[PDB]
Amino acid sequence: ASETFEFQAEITQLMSLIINTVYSNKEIFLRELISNASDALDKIRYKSLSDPKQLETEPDLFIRITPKPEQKVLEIRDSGIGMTKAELINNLGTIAKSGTKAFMEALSAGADVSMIGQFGVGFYSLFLVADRVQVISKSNDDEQYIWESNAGGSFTVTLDEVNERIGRGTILRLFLKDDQLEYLEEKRIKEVIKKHSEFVAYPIQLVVTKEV
Amino acid sequence: ASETFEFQAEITQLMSLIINTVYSNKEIFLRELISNASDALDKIRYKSLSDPKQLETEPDLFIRITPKPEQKVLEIRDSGIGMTKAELINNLGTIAKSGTKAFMEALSAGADVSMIGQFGVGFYSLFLVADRVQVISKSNDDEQYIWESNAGGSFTVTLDEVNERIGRGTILRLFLKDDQLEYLEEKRIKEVIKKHSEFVAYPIQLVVTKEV
Numbered sequence A, B: 001a002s003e004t005f006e007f008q009a010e011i012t013q014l015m016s017l018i019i020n021t022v023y024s025n026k027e028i029f030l031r032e033l034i035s036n037a038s039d040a041l042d043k044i045r046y047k048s049l050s051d052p053k054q055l056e057t058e059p060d061l062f063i064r065i066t067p068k069p070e071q072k073v074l075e076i077r078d079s080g081i082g083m084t085k086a087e088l089i090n091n092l093g094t095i096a097k098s099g100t101k102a103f104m105e106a107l108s109a110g111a112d113v114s115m116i117g118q119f120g121v122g123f124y125s126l127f128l129v130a131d132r133v134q135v136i137s138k139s140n141d142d143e144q145y146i147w148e149s150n151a152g153g154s155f156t157v158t159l160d161e162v163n164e165r166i167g168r169g170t171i172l173r174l175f176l177k178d179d180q181l182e183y184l185e186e187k188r189i190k191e192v193i194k195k196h197s198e199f200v201a202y203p204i205q206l207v208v209t210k211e212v
């Protein structure tokens, strides 16, 4: 059974602006999600300094990108700190409020959409290329949970009995818009990664399917 | 909650012989599993001739091989007919009895282990390289289930609330022996596939992880 929650209204507004914008450089979403992945990895590593056992649920520290062409899905995974049910609700449904409000004001004055992660709300840039997202997350402190949004005013959180087990960390599962399926292609994915992420401390793994 | 079942004793015997054998050409397991995958795909396609809706749960017809190095796991997937809970029990725990008995007699006389799929029991050759297997299966007729064996006399079947959803078909998840980790490597995997499977009607997809 799902539970339904309301977004802070300013987040809803930002999602509306992003999902509908004709902004041309949609590729910036990948930089923002890799940056969030890298931050979540920094947290578990720093946390582990005083609690090394925290690492044991998933000792490999990575960012992993997995196109799933038949489902028109792109997944961005990290083995970072992960989020509890309460953290998914709070991180994704609430605390972005102040950053989103400041960002929308900047946008009104003519700020580039690419400034979004300087306002600390780069997560929502996924709506440039996707019309739906599932955030699947496993924290050492909770069960695995699925947070789901379609850019509307409400989101769901559901105990996860349907997805692969993450040892620890987070998968952003992006349901790509029909005109943004280039983000399923290995050459395109590599090209975007290479541009705006050379100083990532973690391996960035691309999962490719090849016919033998 | 798992349920526990007993193997037909001759299957238990065959698993013991295979898991312990010093037979040198262990690579033959992959041919046997690809052959079973191809057969299961033939069944859903033939079934669909009169019931085209059967295909809709997973329209792409494929065999897919996925090394998971950190877990020391190799997965072999097909989108074939799949198995219900009752079929997993019967196909894997029971009906192999007659083939296994005939095969063990052949082996006593000096038959090559590679003859195993001519006795219709090639599935058990996975124990050349693995000491544990989960068969994760989704039939159009049932929920997703996990059948699990460690070559002992009993197996478990558990309703699946932990793995990715298969639309339809079967994953063999092989937990590789510590000396058989070469089967995690892309070059090795491709080399074995190419030898003893050129007349497979279905794409054979290798899922490789590459650092960008």
Ligand SMILES: O=C1CCCC/C=C/CCOC(=O)c2c(O)cc(O)c(Cl)c2C1
Pocket (backbone or CB within 6 Å): A033, A036, A037, A039, A040, A041, A043, A078, A080, A081, A082, A083, A091, A092, A123, A169, A170, A172
């Ligand atoms: O708030 C988040 C990111 C904010 C920056 C740093 C905080 C990290 C710890 C929890 O965040 C996460 O697990 C996490 C992630 O792994 C990937 C993501 O794309 C997102 Cl959006 C999040 C949630």
Ligand SMILES: O=C1CCCC/C=C/CCOC(=O)c2c(O)cc(O)c(Cl)c2C1
Pocket (backbone or CB within 6 Å): B033, B036, B037, B039, B040, B041, B043, B078, B080, B081, B082, B083, B091, B092, B123, B169, B170, B172
């Ligand atoms: O008995 C099986 C194979 C016997 C040959 C043909 C019967 C196919 C229909 C059901 O089998 C399956 O789904 C199936 C599969 O997809 C892959 C496998 O490795 C195995 Cl072992 C099986 C189970």
